[PDB]
Each structure stands twice: as C-alpha cells, then as structure tokens.
C-alpha cells in the first residue's frame, strides 16, 4: 500500500532542486554522476584529537558547542564511501544521504534543526574529510586544479 | 599462452637479489634458473662436501618445526613471533602473515593462544 505514495514522494524529492542556483537532479547526465565513491586516505602522523579539534574550531562555525571527542592516535589508512559526486557547469559537488529522521513529522526541519543534528551526530568531521578527499581526488586527476 | 600472442609488447623489469641468506639463495636459484642440487654421479663428488653452498648456523630465515598438537603448534608460533619481534627493533606485525591449510580447524587454537597473552605480551591479530 505504501508504493503509490512512495513514488510520488520520490518525484517530490526529484522535483526539489538542491543547489545555490537552483539545479535539479534531472539535469545530471550519467557521465556527470558517480555513486558510492570509495576512497582510502593515508595519514602518517599520530592523529591527536586536541590538535585537530582546535584546527576545526578555528574555521568551522558549527564548532561553537560540541565538546571534543576523544580517540587514540590513529596512524595508517582511513576508509570512506561518498554517496554521490556530480559536476555541473564546470563545478564539482558532493551529496550524501541521511534518512533516519525519527523525531520530526511536522515542517520543523529548518536550517537550525539540521545544524543541530549536524552538531549532535558530529557529521562535520565526516564532511570535512569528504572535502579533503574530493580535493585530493581533483588534484590527482585534473591537472592545473584550483580548490 | 602469453608468448603465443602476436601483437603483445613484452617488458621485463627484474630486480636481482644478492644471495646472502638461505631464502635469498633459494630465490636467486629460482630466478637465475640454475641447478645447485649435487647428485654425486662420481665418488669424488660424493666424498667431498665443500662443493655445496655454506649455510651459516645463525641463519634463521627458513626453519622447519615439528609439533604434537594444534594447540602446542600455535603456542610455539607465538613465542617464535615474540622472539622475532625482539630480535629486530624495526619490525611491524602488519608485515607478518600466517597462512594455515585449514582455517576453521586451527582458528580456535589461534584465538586461544593469542587472547591469553598479558598486556606486555599481547600482539594484535
């Protein structure tokens, strides 16, 4: 019984544009899109949480709260699975999917609630590592690259 | 099957190994395609034994071990890996691999002898 409501909801997802200029998902060709990019990121220094969280809080505005997590010195490789990477008018963009969203049923999912969810689930480090991986990928692939 | 291809471009990049250890001796004998096994067709080759290659008694590259049970085998292997980690100061356990003929038969014994070590003796597996 959920099928005829789900597909129109899917079209409601597809009709909604997701860009600063108003670019929808239907304008993306098959060669422009890339789904589930798996990347390995090396690190040769011992990853100190105190030297990293301060560097994040120096530039990221969402790190006003969020007291820093504690983890051991991790030296080696880091795995990651980006959901979607797509280019448009000569500019690359990243897209990830979060779909739990149990606590909201009304229209209260504004930018403040999404920022609070990003600060609670700590997706800022994941998005920063995704930006670092995409920057390294576009530097290795495309010659004469600017961030 | 590779040599039978007509339009194949064959490139060779072989790094020679200097034969000093026993394992390096075996790899050099395999790479250079030579027969170092002395059959001894005559009595002069059978009497003398200095025509072979000298093997140092401290060369612990290739060792063969006889055990009595799957528990005691990996219990000896853990102590030998600890001795190898103590012998070389720059040695990573990531660079050490252990391959078994049957994983399901030895894996209980491996987990048992690898979990029982204290904090100064424990290596990650």
């Amino acid at each position: 019984q959920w099928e005829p409501v789900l597909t129109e909801w899917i079209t409601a997802v597809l009709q909604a544009p997701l860009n600063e200029t108003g670019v929808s998902l239907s304008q993306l060709s098959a060669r422009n899109k890339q789904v589930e990019m798996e990347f390995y990121l090396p690190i040769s220094e011992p990853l100190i949480a105190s030297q990293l969280d301060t560097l994040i809080r120096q530039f990221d505005p969402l790190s006003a709260g969020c007291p820093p997590l504690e983890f051991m010195q991790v030296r080696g490789m880091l795995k990651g699975f980006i959901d979607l990477v797509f280019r448009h008018e000569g500019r690359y963009y990243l897209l990830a999917y979060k779909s739990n969203w149990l606590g909201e049923d009304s229209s209260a999912y504004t930018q403040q609630a999404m920022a609070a969810a990003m600060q609670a689930h700590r997706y800022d480090l994941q998005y920063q590592l995704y930006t670092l991986a995409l920057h390294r990928y576009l530097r290795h692939r495309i010659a004469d690259y600017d961030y | 099957l590779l040599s039978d291809l007509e339009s194949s471009q064959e490139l060779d990049a072989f790094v020679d190994v200097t034969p000093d250890n026993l394992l390096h001796n075996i790899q050099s004998d395999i790479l250079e395609l030579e027969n170092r096994a002395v059959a001894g067709v005559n009595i002069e080759e059978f009497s003398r034994s200095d025509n072979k290659r000298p093997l140092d008694p401290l060369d612990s590259s290739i060792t063969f071990h006889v055990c009595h049970s799957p528990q005691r085998e990996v219990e000896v292997l853990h102590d030998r890996l600890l001795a190898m980690l103590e012998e070389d100061p720059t040695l990573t356990p990531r660079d050490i691999i252990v391959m078994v003929a049957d994983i399901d038969s030895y894996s209980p014994f491996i987990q048992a002898v690898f979990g029982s070590a204290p904090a100064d003796r424990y290596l990650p597996y």
Partner: peptide
C-alpha cells in the same frame, strides 16, 4: 638446573588500524 624466560623490552606494535568515520565516532 636453573632456567629462565626471556622478556620483551618494548610494545609489540603501535596503533595501526584501517578504520572509517564510524570508527572515529
């Protein structure tokens, strides 16, 4: 006769692990 056991001087290995974002959270 008297017999003793050898003792390891240092730790066997550093914290080397190939993890993901969920491992750091």
């Amino acid at each position: 006769a008297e017999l003793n056991a050898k003792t390891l001087q240092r730790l066997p290995g550093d914290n080397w692990r190939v993890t993901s974002y969920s491992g750091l959270q």
